[PDB]
Ligand binder design. Structure first.
Ligand SMILES: NC(=O)c1ccc[n+]([C@@H]2O[C@H](COP(=O)([O-])OP(=O)(O)OC[C@H]3O[C@@H](n4cnc5c(N)ncnc54)[C@H](OP(=O)(O)O)[C@@H]3O)[C@@H](O)[C@H]2O)c1
Length: 416
């Protein structure tokens, strides 16, 4: 209830800033397809247990739906619907020929063995084959899913389809040995770095030697901090895990920080540096701020203390709308959540193109194409933000929903 209602409220807020017909808004409120299936597997003890799987294709006007799969024991149908709703305009803003999709299974993979995980993935594919495909619905990695599981899923889809078409293209995020694409690990970070560089160029500020404060030191956060450090010439000054944050004015090299975290389970007490909580970490005076951690991290309470000129929210909605408004009134250029982390879905689209075309690119071509796509999308959103004189999230939403609306009108779905 809560996630889908939040998503539809955000869609209404975005739509009231532009001229969109009521019928189109009502159509976009309801996802096109919802598939709730029972996924049965045989456990290692011999018993047969059935889980509940959801596959929501929110829209496919612009093209085949693209959406991730989450294996976590809490999400429900409404959560998957809201995430597919987000995926729709996340692929729309990047100007991809994709619709919005999402997948999930109510399951806790912590206690599932490797054989059990493989059986669950294969049975999920067997259940949802009738509504997925290379040209209809492309699954993507998400929470608690890895390239191994979706290599298994692609194998099952190939077995069912009898190798009639491009099986490798049914699912993305696959291992490089079987249908994989270069740059998948660094996709989100690369997209975020491209967006930060474009925002800096828009603001006319040089990034040579500037300061970046990154909250959240996961895979995406670490790669963002590193890619900033070398590519942007930026001085990394803040990285935080779930335990605490690390500060040093002179600069941090993410490699040894990651080694320390892997050695002792956390980055706490890094040599030659001070320990600061994430709450005061968001209060640093830097040039770039990157929240790459738990969502709704910047709230209305601490929004007044934010001083970074450019903030790029890698995480999914880590800034509350009120805090977003307070950052807007402070002259702070803020990259939308679904535009900053769109590198992952853009690289997944590139992987799908490689699979369907039968031609595999090098990391150089993938990086160049991701750079071009990010630049074009960001500057389209930036021009919209100046033209309509509304916040950057709303500009990105307007661009994405306008693209989806135009796709619907061209297909004849909506006559208004
Ligand atoms: N075939 C393949 O290519 C393949 C297969 C398997 C794995 N992999 C790779 O192996 C990795 C698996 O690990 P992961 O991606 O799950 O790592 P992660 O989520 O970034 O974090 C590692 C673990 O630490 C916890 N954690 C959460 N937030 C954290 C933070 N800020 N700092 C430190 N720890 C935190 C997480 O559990 P909680 O959040 O619940 O505390 C998680 O289980 C993947 O990134 C994937 O690329 C690849």
């Amino acid at each position: 209830i809560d996630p889908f209602e939040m998503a539809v409220k955000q869609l209404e807020r975005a739509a009231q800033y532009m001229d969109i017909s009521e019928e189109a808004l009502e159509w976009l409120k309801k996802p096109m397809r919802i598939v709730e299936v029972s996924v049965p597997i045989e456990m290692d003890d011999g018993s047969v247990k059935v889980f509940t799987g959801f596959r929501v294709q929110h829209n496919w006007a612009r093209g085949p739906t693209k959406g991730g799969i989450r294996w976590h024991p809490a999400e429900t149908l409404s959560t998957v619907k809201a995430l597919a709703t987000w995926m729709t305009w996340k692929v729309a803003v990047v100007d991809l020929p994709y619709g919005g999709g999402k997948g999930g299974i109510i399951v806790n993979p912590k206690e599932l063995s490797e054989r059990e995980q493989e059986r669950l993935a294969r049975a999920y594919i067997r259940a949802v084959y009738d509504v997925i495909g290379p040209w209809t619905d492309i699954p993507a990695p998400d929470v608690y899913t890895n390239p191994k599981i979706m290599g298994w899923m692609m194998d099952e889809y190939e077995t069912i389809m009898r190798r009639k078409g491009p099986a490798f293209g049914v699912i993305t995020g696959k291992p490089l040995s079987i249908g994989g694409s270069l740059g998948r690990g660094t996709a989100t970070a690369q997209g975020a770095i491209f967006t930060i560089r474009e925002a800096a160029k828009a603001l006319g500020i040089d990034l040579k030697g500037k300061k970046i404060a990154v909250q959240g030191y996961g895979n995406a956060g670490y790669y963002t901090a590193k890619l900033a450090k070398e590519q942007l010439g930026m001085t990394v000054v803040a990285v935080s895990d779930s335990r605490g944050g690390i500060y040093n004015p002179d600069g941090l090299d993410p490699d040894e920080v990651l080694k320390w975290k892997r050695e002792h389970g956390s980055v706490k007490d890094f040599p030659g540096a001070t320990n600061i909580t994430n709450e005061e970490l968001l209060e640093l005076e830097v040039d770039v701020l990157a929240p790459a951690a738990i969502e709704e991290v910047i709230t209305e309470k601490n929004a007044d203390n934010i001083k970074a000129k450019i903030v790029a929210e890698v995480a999914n909605g880590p800034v509350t709308p009120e805090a977003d408004d307070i950052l807007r009134e402070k002259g702070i250029l803020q990259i939308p959540d679904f535009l900053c982390n769109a590198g992952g879905v853009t690289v997944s689209y590139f992987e799908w193109v490689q699979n369907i075309n039968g031609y595999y690119w090098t990391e150089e071509e993938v990086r160049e194409k991701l750079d071009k796509k990010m630049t074009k999308a960001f500057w389209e959103v930036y021009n919209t933000h100046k033209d309509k004189n509304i916040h950057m999230r709303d500009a990105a939403y307007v661009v994405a929903v306008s693209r989806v609306y135009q796709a619907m009108k061209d297909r004849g779905w909506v006559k208004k």
